[PDB]
Structures are given as C-alpha cells and as structure tokens.
Write a protein that binds this ligand. Structure first.
Ligand SMILES: O[C@@H]1Cc2ccccc2[C@H]1O
Ligand SMILES: O[C@@H]1Cc2ccccc2[C@H]1O
Lengths: 390, 388
C-alpha cells in the first residue's frame, strides 16, 4: 500500500517516435473496408496524429489527478486508483476493466460517481471507487507465475478491499471485468453486497426447446454470440493459446500494438465509419499508450490463456453453474458485441434488482457514454437500497 | 514468362539490422517452456545469430542457382522455379509449399529428383520440377483483389503447366500445398496423372460407430485433430478472420515475424527441445527472410481468409467431400501435426496407389528429411507407372 504516480521517462517517448517514424507498412487488398481488419488509410492517418498531435504529458497529468497506489497481493504487484466520495454514506464499489481496456476508460465517470453534488446528481447516490489494474495489465504489470485466472484475481481483489477497510462493497465491470466481478461475488460473498455488469453473455442450452417463444430481438442476441464465435474470436483464440508468440510483435511494434487494440474499438463500439465515432482519438491513444508504455500486450494476453477453459473459444463448454444469488444489476448497451437474453439471465441469476436497456453506446460504456453509465449506476445503487430494506 | 533473379537491396538489409538492434523484448512467465509460444531465452539467442552470424547473401546465392521465372496469371504475379531433368522421359511434377513455408523448403531435394542418376536413383524415376510460390506468398507477392481461394489458385497452376507445355503432370504438396494439389487434381483432371500428398487430415464423422475396430494409433491420430483445433489453431483463426490487423505488427517487427513463423517449426517438426533439432537455423532464417523481405506476412495471411469456409476453424465445419478419383499417394511423417487414418482416407480417395509410413520427420518433409522424401517420391512415381 504505497502511493504511486505515473512518470514516463522522456527516453520512452523518444523511442516511441523513433519506431513510429520507421514504420514499415503492409500492402492491402483494396475494396475490403474494415472486413479483414484495420484499413491502411485509417491507420496511417491515426499514426500521423499519434506521432505529431497526441499529447501524452497531458494524458499523464490527467491520470495523475487520480490517487493511485501499488501493493503486493499473492505474489504480484497490484496497481489501483482509490477515490473517496465527497458524501458520507456512499456505496463502496470496485470497478474492473477488461481487454483491450484499462483504468483510463473511467476518467470521465469518476468525478460524477464520487461527487454527484458537483455534477447535478443526488448526494444520496454517491460511490467510493476502487479501480484496480488487472494483474498482467497496465501499471499492475506482468504476473510472475502461472495461475492468475478468474478466482485468483477475485481473491486478490477481496484482499485489496480488506486492506482498504471496506467490509461491504459492490462490484462492477464489463468485458473480462464483468466475469471477474461475477466470480468475486461468489468468492467474497460475505463482503459483496451487489453486482453490476454492463456485459453479460447468456449462451443457449443446445436444446432447441429453450428457444420456444423467444422474440426476434432475443434470437438476434443469440445469433450475435454465434457470429462472434465464427468471425470475431480470432484475437481470443491466439491469446488463449500462444500469447507469448504474439507478444513479440506487439511489444516491438507500436503500429502493430495500435492496430491490434483499435480494431476492437471499431467493432465493439457504437460506430459507423471510424472508432472515433464512439471514442475520440486522444482517448483511443491514451488507452493504447498504457499497453505500449508498460509493455503489457503479452502479459495481458496471458490472462486469456489462464482462463481458456471458461471462454467461448473453449473446446467444450464449462459445466452449467449453480445460480448466483448476488443482487444483480444488468446494463445492456445496444452496440455491444454480446447481449443477454433476459429469460436466460433470470434462470442463472435469481436476484436481479436492476435491468436496463440503454439507447446508445457499445462495449466500452463508461468511455463511450459516461452520462448514461453514471445515470445507470446511480439507478442500480438506488435499486440496491430499495431491495435491501423492502 | 520472364527470367527471375533475387537481388535484395542492401538498404533492406541495413533496415533489418536496425530493427533487430532496436528490438524491444516482452516479459515472460518463467518456467512455461514452449507451452504458451516461443520462449524468450531461445528467441533472444536466435535473433542474436540472425543479426551477427546469418549470411543472407550466401542464401540468396543458393536460391539463385535454381532457374526461376515470373509470369502473370489471372491478374496476379506468379513466381516459380522450373528445373528440367537431364532425362527427357521425366515425370513433370508441380510441388506446392504451404504456410509458413516457402519454395526454399525444397532446395535439397531438387537435384536428387531431377538427376537421379547422380544421386543413387534409377533414371526411370526422374522428374521435371515446377515449384511455384503461392499467390500472396514470397516472390509471387501480394494479390491485387479478393477471391484467391483454393479453386482460383488451382486454376492458376493448371494455366502455368499449360504454358510450360506440360499436358500430363503429377502434383505434390504438404500443408496448404496438399489442399491446393488435391483441388488441382479435380480442377485439371484431364492433365493431372496423379497426386502425392505428405499431409492429409481425415476427420471422424462424429458417429461413434465409425470408430469401431480402430487401433490405439489411429484413435490417437483423430485425437491429434481435436488437440489441434483446441490448442494449435490460434494462428489459423486470426489469419482467417482479421489478417490485415495482424499484418501491421508482423510487417513492422522482424522479431515478431520470426516468432510467428518459427513457433510452427518447433510444434510441427520432428523436434525435442528446439526447432533446430529438425531444421538448422540457417534454413529456418532463410525461410523467415523470404516472408520478411517480401513483406508477405499479411498477404500470405489473407489466403486463410479466402479459404476460411473449408478450414478446421470454419464457422460451420465443412461437409464431408465426395470421393475424389485421382490416383493418390500418401506419405505419413510420424511427427506431423495431423496424420490420416487409412480406413477413412480410402473412403475419401478410392484410388490410393501408394501409402508410406515414414520413420522420421515432421510437417516439413522435404526440408527435414530430404533423403526420405526423395525415396518416397520416386516410389510414388513407380507406383503410378505400374498401376494406372
Ligand atoms: O467483445 C468480446 C465478446 C466476448 C465474449 C466472451 C468474453 C469476452 C468478450 C469480449 O471481449
Ligand atoms: O496449417 C496446417 C493446417 C492443419 C489442419 C489440421 C491439423 C494441423 C494443421 C496445420 O499444420
């Protein structure tokens, strides 16, 4: 438990610009748009801005306005932001990012969540926030040994909240952070008072009977899963099997690191022509910079290998889980890469206290739609309070 | 159709050495060996040799001892080696490499196949060789448009053989070259006299009854397929879906390009502790240099996208093909990444005339075991002459 500040040596930035200037670009097949990955023309334009335009020092300053700390847990370094609320009886909540994200995703929602009185919110709806970097990611950095899977991350987090003195807290996440949050609600069930996910997958049974009566939208959600498996799972299959092989090119090549990550902001964000439709280029590059500067493309990929058996890329599906009794909030963003079927969600989670279908935004909710994210999490906190005393 | 010679600008070599010198290495998780991909200590040592000891000019010299040509077919550049036998009666054969291989794989089998008299062979077993670079690969280079799938590549080859004046020829391949050869045997059935593959997958139906009576060795071969899908197919899934995203890092980073390729030489070769157990490092780096210097990591990856529908990684597993009538030779190398169950192969190919189970070697047969490969192909020629 020691204070932490991001201080990037100028030498690292000079090296980055050296590499950018020396980029060797591939050929392309014309007329294929985004269908086979990041198009050449777009990436050239974004790289030009990255090299001459993007301001890391300002991003660095902004990140450093948030209190950060590091601490060692279960043999590994855990970096985390901790922002105390301006209001007494605030709900402690630990928010977890996923891949290819980072703690930078949450910069625009931290102040409205923790200080609602200064952002037109109700003081009754305040949060204390703990926002940790996943082991292997960003400023937490590489893990030293095998075995950092969902329950090991969850146990680390429970220990983090214990050290911080939160005996009662909620958990929140999207992407892999949602899976970690759901896992933690079981692992630390004595201390977790509620769970909110903005990403939820509900696979079908495989029995054509459980589809009876489902409407067009729910059937389309199931189709989205199948499409993801067929077409969108490439990154997941390679990171879950040979993350180290992949890591050499992503650690050596900043354009390669950028393409690898920015593709997902295009495909999973609420976009039309460009990833910048949903996330502006400074935020896009700041997130990529956290991967690049900490050189965590590979260590973050190893997470997928550790949890390969519970991914959709698993050979055989994991056995059906017993119901998770955690009071649950679900937020469904319309451009997300996967969306839950409520009938199926009701079976797996008997205590849903909050369900919202939002009007806009994709996979990176806090970053894409901070206003909606904040309003939704407040309504979840209100629903939690309501469900506990009635 | 014009003569071709490899002449790499010095500036490209200077650029490569600058990149190698400036390599930024990743973290590792110690003690995981090769289980999660190419280990850090090994690759640092290989890159050291690449930078300090490897001699591209000598490799370039050896490649250029092979007569090579380029020609435009169906809108794309096609590079190929063409080596005539001194025996006029020789069997013409087109040999196709796969991924992450190249025409450099066959340097040690060319003279024995085309001049058997000087290399322990019978003049009756001579070949004329045509050894093309796949469209999108090596010195053929990037294709200009969508659609270069197996039938389109096969058609291009039939056209190449027609242009060379070969109205009767055999086809040979491993990896994707075997799939291309099998496709070509159907596409140009009039002119293909026989097909030899040193790579063949035989998927089970999924009906438990079809496994009845199979010995433990054949059951293990089927399980090899399952293991490949589960753990070995990462490169195939990303190249078949987002090859262009992948291409940026592989085209910009020589250590990345090296890791991406050399992993398969470890996993698919007859290896123990190192890929150099099966293929020495000069040959390994020469093959990688062909990808690096032609900047074809991306365009070679696009081939997988074009054929995604027939891969193991397909959205829906491809329906079992009807039987193919081509006279077929099959060579099974014991360390290969996949190996056929003969009972199943003979249902898919009712005219198998040659079946060899070799006792050494993996996926890169001509490169790993040139002696075994030459003997087997000569045996195949003899099987074709005495059965048809
Ligand atoms: O968008 C992706 C869809 C999916 C499915 C399972 C786990 C994670 C994820 C996301 O990364
Ligand atoms: O790339 C090859 C294609 C394939 C198909 C089945 C098993 C292994 C393999 C690979 O060795």
């Amino acid at each position: 438990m020691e204070p932490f500040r991001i201080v990037i040596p100028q030498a690292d930035l000079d090296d980055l610009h050296r590499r950018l200037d020396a980029t060797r670009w591939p050929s392309e097949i014309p007329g294929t748009g985004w269908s086979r990955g990041v198009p050449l023309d777009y990436l050239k334009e974004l790289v030009g801005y990255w090299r001459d335009g993007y301001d890391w020092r300002a991003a660095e300053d902004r990140l450093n306005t948030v209190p950060q700390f590091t601490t060692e847990i279960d043999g590994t370094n855990v970096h985390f932001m901790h922002i105390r609320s301006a209001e007494p009886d605030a709900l402690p909540m630990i928010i977890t990012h996923g891949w290819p994200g980072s703690v930078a995703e949450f910069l625009d929602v931290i102040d409205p969540l923790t200080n609602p009185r200064a952002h037109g919110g109700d003081p009754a709806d305040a949060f204390h926030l703990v926002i940790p970097s996943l082991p292997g990611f960003g400023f937490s950095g590489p893990t030293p040994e095998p075995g950092w899977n969902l329950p090991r991350v969850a146990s680390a987090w429970a220990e983090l909240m214990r050290r911080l003195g939160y005996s009662r807290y909620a958990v929140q996440g999207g992407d892999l952070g949602a899976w970690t949050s759901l896992t933690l609600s079981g692992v630390d069930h004595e201390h977790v008072v509620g769970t909110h996910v903005n990403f939820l997958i509900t696979p079908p049974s495989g029995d054509p009977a459980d589809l009876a009566g489902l409407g067009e939208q729910d059937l389309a959600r199931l189709q989205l899963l199948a499409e993801f498996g067929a077409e969108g799972s490439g990154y997941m299959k390679i990171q879950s099997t040979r993350p180290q092989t992949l890591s050499y090119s992503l650690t050596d090549s900043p354009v390669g690191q950028l393409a690898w990550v920015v593709e997902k902001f295009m495909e999973w964000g609420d976009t039309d022509k460009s990833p910048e439709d949903a996330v502006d280029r400074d935020r896009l590059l700041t997130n990529v910079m956290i991967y690049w500067l900490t050189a965590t493309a590979g260590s973050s990929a190893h997470f997928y290998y550790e949890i390969s058996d519970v991914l959709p890329t698993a050979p055989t599906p994991p056995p059906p889980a017993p119901p998770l009794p955690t009071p649950l909030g679900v937020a469904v963003y319309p451009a997300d890469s996967a969306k839950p079927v409520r009938r199926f969600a009701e079976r797996a989670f008997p205590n849903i206290v909050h369900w919202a279908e939002l009007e806009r935004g994709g996979h990176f909710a806090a970053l894409e739609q901070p206003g909606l994210f904040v309003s939704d999490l407040r309504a979840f906190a209100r629903a939690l309070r309501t469900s506990h005393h009635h």
